[PDB]
Every structure is written in structure tokens, then in C-alpha cells.
């Protein structure tokens, strides 16, 4: 865009002169009738007038013209309307570190309208990505990707229609297609682990995937943990050279399980509180193995389940229900309130109580109402957005701040008897939808009832 | 395209003056016939009038001119009317996997009017294409090809007549001419299957 200001002062000095020549003719008429006491007359007249004029003239003139001009211009090119910049991090959930990390990613609009596919350049290189780490670290800010040319001298471009669709729909997703990265190997010469720039994990990962059984487990803080364990493919003679792997041995060595009393346990929790899931090939093979073993409960025969290559075993927790992505979300009515009952002292501003770290991740927020002796609903602060009332503690006593909406002040106890109810919403009950219509009456959704105490009992 | 808005306020203060000098001649005539009960007369007259005038004048003037101007412009270059972008996937229906996949493809209009022949760049590299698989995977969205050049700093250009024919006929086909890609071989030393970047399936 550009703005132009212009001033203009014009002095116009003008001359003029003139002559004129007029020639005028004229023919007059007249009649007249006069009358007196005894005298009457009449008269007839006519006149012939010529005339001739000549007008000589001259003029001088000034003019002072002052002008102020304001102008504004907005140029645009429909092919190069917008430039993009991503703020991204790198996450290693694996087990081995990867060196010289260069992911190949993709900017995508809409359903599958791909804007661009970009390989990570030398500004975007990560030297080390150790497992259970981020690049860059979590305290630091994520990195910026804004380039297309392998030499980082050209920005990523968006045209006009995609720009309009982006500002309408706000749907811009990011895909991780493939990741480049090297292995550093040990040297027996001097002990120094050195990077081979020639070899990459691209050589190695399909070799691992085609020779192992994969097991995903989420009993450690509802987080999907994947481990691949070498197991025998019978149709491959080299693959049959491995020792046999039972399922129980695999679960023992892979997840740190134990039988402290002859019973397979993850931490202090029994294996029988976990449920098993298989894809169709692995489920068929487990069906065949249980048919041969003449057993029904799999939990009894875990030391006898022979594993094979390319198996897939999902092991979850029965108490909490999950989504399509197997993310923790919210259990049965026989689980919530069945155990969320602590003996603690009631107070103002908020509720100091200890909620189990696993259990709290399945709740989206809380609802605080007040019940009459006869029974009346006067929700303290309604709407989905103001629903979140939970916080973090330094000693383990996760707060529920009731002094959040009452003018940055405390709850209104109109009577000591007045019952103070606090409820919670499972992620499968209250949704991501925030103030769709701004009304959003919190009464119309599944609410469980955990805490219920008398105000006078509070003291 | 560009739009321009313009406002203009003009104050014009004007002066004028004048003189004039008129010289007028005039020749009048007259005849007259009078009649009574017993009295009849007649009369003849003529007149000679000179005259001379001089008009001296002066003028002052203001002018307030307010203007609002709207303008719109659409520039175009007939050789560079359109830019292209393909959304494509890679399919392996074979039996052996192929590594560092770089297909050579072709954008074609009409019957055989080839727009462009583009080798896959480093944004378009596929490290692994195992058989009975796609690059990228079917849940993900296909990849974008929009740059014929090596360092990939030039969009895929279409001129005017091809642009008109494309928006009329909607026939834009894609050919797969040849595919670059390497073999990884087994090593008897450590069991590790390693890529020879020198050899390619073109030999084989």
C-alpha cells in the first residue's frame, strides 16, 4: 500500500481584448386621434432610423489556484497473497536417539488440500533428539519454518482463494510424512560413539517393523507407550533362529512387570484390570492358540501365548473409557464417584482436596451449584467457557476455586443450612464446543456428584 | 489487481476587471399627416444622434471543488497467467521395496499437449516405498508438487490459451514417465541392509 500527498500552487495571468461593430435599422409607426369640445384631429407617422456602433474592449486577469491532494493505493497479486510461517517442535517418544533430524512435513488446508510439502532445512536441523525429549526444550519457544527453496531464500506462498478459505474456516493442519536422521554407532577402538552420516534410520525401521510384535500400553499416566519385541516368523528360516517369546515374559521385560506374589503386576495394579485388543490377523492367531490350548481366560495362560512377527497388541485400562485415538476420556457411572470421596475440611475461596493424577486427566471441568433445603437450582457461574474451576498445587492438593467468578470474591451463603454442591464433567460429556450460542446452560449435560457438604458444617 | 481511492479539495480564488467604450450614431426619420374638420397639415422630420459610453467593471470570485475518485485496475501477463499445483500419491504394487523414490512425471493438456515434464525434487522425495503401500499413507493427505526447477524456486507456469482451454475442457492428465530409486542390499558383515546410492533399479 502507498499514500501520496500533493500540494499545488498555480498563478495564471491572463490577457484579453475585444472589438465589436453593430449595425442597427429601425422602422417606426404611429397613428393618433385627438378630440376636443369642437376640435377633432388625426395623425399618421412613420420613422426610418439607421444606426452603427463599435465597441472596443480589453481585459487583464489573475488566478491563484491552491490544491491539496490526498491519494491511497493498495496493490495485490492474486498468486502471492500470503506468506506462511510455522511454529513447531520435535518430539521423541521412541527409545533410541536420532541424530541430524530433518523431518519432511506438509501444510494442508481443508480436507486434503495440500498447500505445500517442505523438507526441513539447515535452519531447522536438530542435532540430538534423545527419547522423551523435545527440540527445542519445553521452556524455550518452538522453531520457525518459513522457507521453500533448499537454500531458504524463498518464502512459502498462498494464493487468493486459499487465503479467503483460511480466514473463513481457520483449518490449517500439518502432516509429518517422513523423518530423516542418522545413527551414531559405538567404536571399539576408543569407545567414542560416532555418527555415520551414510546410514539412516530409513534403512532400519522397516526391518524392525517386519520382524517384531508391537505392543501399545497406556497404564503409565494414560500415555500410549509403544514397544516392539522380536518374535519368530515361522516361514522365515533366519527369523526362526531366535529364542521363543511368551507373552508374559514379553510383558515382564518390556514394561517392567513383575510377579511379586506369582501374579503379573504393573506397579501395584493387577494385570486382570487391563483389557486386550488385537487386529484381525493377531486376534485370529490368538483364537487359534486358545483353541489349541483348550482354555478360555487368556489371563490364565499368559505364560503360554506364543508370539509372532507383525503382531499388534493394545492393552488398556477397563475403568476409563477411550476415544478413536485411544486417548483417556471418561469411565462408567460405576467408576466415577465410586472412588472420588475424600474426608477433608470445607472452606471458602476454593476446595483443597487431593485428586488422583490419573483420574483428573479424564475430567474437562466442574459445575458449582447451591441446593435449597427444599431443593432449588442456583448455579454459581454457568456457561461452558467459565466451566473450568480446577488449578495446580505445590503440595498435591489440586484446588477447585469457587471465588473465581463472584467479583474476585467468595461464595454467597444466604443461609448456613444451604447445601454446596460441586460436580464434574467427563471429557465424553462436556465437549470442546465453547459458547456456540453464548447461552450454553450447564444444566443440560451429564454431571456426576462427588462433593456435597453443608455450609454450617464448614464453620 | 489494484484499487485506488482519491479525495481532492480545490479552492480557486479568482479576480477579474473590465472596461468598455461604446460609440453610437443614429439617424431618425418622421412624416406626419394631420386632419381636422377644416385643418389639414403635414410634417417631415429627421434626426442625427451621436453617443459615446464607457463601462468600467470589476469581479471577485470563489470556487470550492470537492472530488471523490474511485479506480480499479487488473493487470495480466499472457505468458504467465496461471500457476499449477498437483496433489499426488505414490503407489507400490510391486514386490520389492524401492528407496529414495524420485518419479519423473508430466503435466499434459488435451490429447497430447504436454504442459511440463517435472522430476521429483527433494521436497518430493520418498525414502521408503514398501510394496502394497502408499506415500504418504492413506489417512494422510497427498503431497504437493508446484515447482519444475531444481532448487524449486519457480512455479509451474501456464499461458493464456492453455488457461482458457483448461477452464473450458477441464482435461488435465498426469503421466508417469520414469521413476528413480535405489536398492538397499544385505551386508554379510553385520547383517545391516544398507543403501547403495550408486545403483538404481534403472539398471535392473
Residue numbers in the entry:
A (entry chain G): 277 to 735
B (entry chain A): 277 to 480
Authors' own words:
Protective antigen (PA), the binding component of this AB toxin, forms an oligomeric pore that translocates lethal factor (LF) or edema factor, the active components of the toxin, into the cell. Three clamp sites aid in peptide translocation: the α clamp, the Φ clamp, and the charge clamp.
To prevent aggregation and migration of the nanodiscs to the air–water interface, we plunge froze the grids within 30 s of sample application. Using our TITaNS methodology, we obtained a 3.3 Å reconstruction of LFN translocating through PApore. Our reconstruction shows a loss of LFN density in the canonical binding site above the PApore. Notably, our reconstruction does not show density for residues 50–135 in the canonical folded LFN position. However, density for residues 136–250 are apparent. In addition, the density for each of the PApore F427 residues was smeared in plane with the benzyl ring suggesting rotameric states moving up and down. Notably, density located at the PApore charge clamp is consistent with an α helix and suggests the deprotonated state of LF favors helix formation within the pore. Interestingly, the receptor binding domain did show different conformations for each protomer and indicates a degree of conformational flexibility.
